[PDB]
Amino acid sequence: PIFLNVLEAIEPGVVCAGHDNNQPDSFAALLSSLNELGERQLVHVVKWAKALPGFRNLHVDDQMAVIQYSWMGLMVFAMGWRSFTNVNSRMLYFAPDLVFNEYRMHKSRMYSQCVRMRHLSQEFGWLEITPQEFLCMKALLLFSIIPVDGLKNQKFFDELRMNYIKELDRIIACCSRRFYQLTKLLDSVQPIARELHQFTFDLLIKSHMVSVDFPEMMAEIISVQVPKILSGKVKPIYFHTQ
Ligand SMILES: C[C@]12CCC(=O)C[C@@H]1CC[C@@H]1[C@@H]2CC[C@]2(C)[C@@H](O)CC[C@@H]12
């Protein structure tokens, strides 16, 4: 099973946020470290994506675009999986050095978005998601958000997305209900990503007022690509009609 060999081989390892756990759990300190984590993870997501089967057949401009649109969903989904494996159902394992308890969820001012992420994390348990299913679903998430006006080569994108969907099907077949369940879970990622897109955008705009630092790559993607999602120029592809 070449496809699963590849997905297991390229899966990124542990990334630390570099958070100073010695300081108080302030809004500014927590969100600055989440931003730093995001910047560090993005480096890993790019290297991961470029090594996926068939990814290099996209036009190079579309390679950059799909990563810049899908990162939030991808990172939230991977975070749910590691939370599921590592911490209890009340906590979120963003990184080994940045674990949110209930107090930090409140102080981050993201309590309601955190509730949704905890629920996503728990679904991995409720649905008994295997590591193989997790890997195939995470790969599909990279191909689940695109411009309404289309990518440079929309045709190659649609064929690649089709091949990832068939891969998920094959992994299940080793049923109809299972495919239904997994596609419903994938769709559930998108409304969570949208709330976080909204939150991070609003925060970048007032970042100097509230003393939150945004690293360079994050500030660029949040001011350039995230507003296209929020204005509806780039939209998630749902399996089921929303
Ligand atoms: C993707 C990250 C960081 C990586 C991860 O584990 C998931 C997590 C989800 C919340 C994001 C965060 C990056 C920084 C963001 C975008 C903040 O600006 C507000 C919400 C944060």
Side-chain angles (χ1 to χ4, degrees):
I2 285 152
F3 178 79
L4 266 181
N5 281 350
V6 174
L7 294 189
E8 288 157 347
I10 64 176
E11 173 72 355
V14 170
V15 180
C16 290
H19 184 56
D20 166 22
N21 286 271
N22 234 44
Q23 82 200 304
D25 280 328
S26 72
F27 178 63
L30 289 178
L31 268 290
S32 297
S33 297
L34 282 168
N35 286 342
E36 181 59 30
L37 184 57
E39 177 98 355
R40 290 176 182 196
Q41 298 236 215
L42 194 50
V43 168
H44 288 93
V45 167
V46 171
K47 287 170 176 185
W48 170 80
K50 282 162 103 179
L52 281 160
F55 183 82
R56 304 297 191 108
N57 287 336
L58 301 171
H59 193 295
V60 62
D61 288 334
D62 297 339
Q63 300 178 18
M64 290 180 55
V66 300
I67 292 162
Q68 292 192 321
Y69 305 143
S70 55
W71 60 276
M72 179 78 74
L74 280 165
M75 288 183 190
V76 167
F77 191 76
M79 188 270 298
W81 176 254
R82 70 179 173 266
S83 288
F84 174 62
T85 68
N86 282 274
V87 289
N88 70 37
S89 65
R90 303 308 299 181
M91 300 207 285
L92 285 177
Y93 192 85
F94 287 107
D97 56 343
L98 187 59
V99 175
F100 269 33
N101 48 25
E102 288 237 349
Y103 178 70
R104 282 164 167 193
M105 291 168 52
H106 174 84
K107 290 317 294 312
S108 68
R109 295 179 200 172
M110 289 203 300
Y111 191 109
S112 63
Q113 294 91 343
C114 289
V115 163
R116 300 185 73 172
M117 294 190 279
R118 289 189 320 189
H119 288 159
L120 173 63
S121 174
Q122 278 155 277
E123 286 279 1
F124 287 116
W126 299 324
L127 293 171
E128 305 171 344
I129 299 304
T130 69
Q132 291 86 359
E133 288 171 329
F134 164 73
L135 293 171
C136 298
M137 284 188 281
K138 185 161 51 63
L140 218 25
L141 273 175
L142 175 63
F143 303 118
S144 298
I145 174 158
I146 57 171
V148 162
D149 244 60
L151 288 178
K152 254 271 214 311
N153 193 334
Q154 193 54 51
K155 187 162 78 66
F156 292 154
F157 173 97
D158 291 335
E159 175 181 306
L160 191 57
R161 169 177 168 89
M162 174 178 78
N163 287 335
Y164 276 80
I165 291 169
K166 293 187 170 148
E167 287 308 348
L168 182 57
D169 200 69
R170 244 112 203 135
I171 279 153
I172 288 163
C174 298
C175 188
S176 253
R177 177 162 200 136
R178 182 64 163 181
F179 185 83
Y180 180 80
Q181 281 170 331
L182 297 200
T183 61
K184 283 296 193 184
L185 175 65
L186 279 167
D187 285 351
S188 76
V189 171
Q190 300 295 340
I192 299 170
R194 166 67 182 237
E195 289 187 352
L196 294 165
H197 283 139
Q198 185 62 68
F199 185 91
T200 195
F201 173 78
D202 289 347
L203 178 60
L204 179 62
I205 299 304
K206 68 192 199 299
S207 55
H208 290 159
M209 202 143 275
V210 294
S211 300
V212 168
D213 171 86
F214 276 84
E216 167 216 317
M217 226 126 127
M218 292 278 279
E220 182 195 309
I221 283 157
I222 295 170
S223 62
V224 172
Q225 315 291 1
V226 162
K228 295 192 200 146
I229 299 174
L230 297 179
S231 64
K233 282 163 66 161
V234 166
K235 283 166 67 77
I237 301 164
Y238 283 98
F239 281 99
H240 308 272
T241 49
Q242 242 54 15

